[PDB]
């Protein structure tokens, strides 16, 4: 069944675990940074699991551009 929150398994290779996580980005303290993928009905993924550099993540958060996770980015939005 499937799960909401910061401790989900965001993708097939998700490295974020509530039992092992530590801060990575300078904006993180006790929670993993996340970003919304606009594919389909949309879903949330951990920014770190997408291999997003900090500045790419911050610029995305400072704009209205939609983001598409690594899994769905190559899908024809046609």
């Amino acid at each position: 069944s499937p799960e909401f929150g910061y401790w989900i398994t965001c993708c097939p290779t998700c490295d974020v675990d509530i039992n092992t996580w530590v801060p990575f980005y300078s904006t993180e303290l006790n929670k993993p940074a996340m970003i919304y993928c606009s594919h389909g009905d949309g879903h949330w993924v951990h920014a770190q699991c997408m291999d997003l550099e900090e500045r790419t993540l911050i610029h995305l958060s400072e704009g209205s551009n939609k983001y598409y996770c690594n899994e769905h980015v190559q899908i024809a939005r046609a």
Binding site: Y6, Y25, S26, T27, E28, L29, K31, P32, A33, M34, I35, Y36, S38, W44, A47, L57, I58, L60, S61, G63, S64, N65, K66, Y67
Partner: peptide
């Protein structure tokens, strides 16, 4: 894009 924990 909408995000979480990206606030300086």
């Amino acid at each position: 894009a909408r995000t979480k924990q990206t606030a300086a």
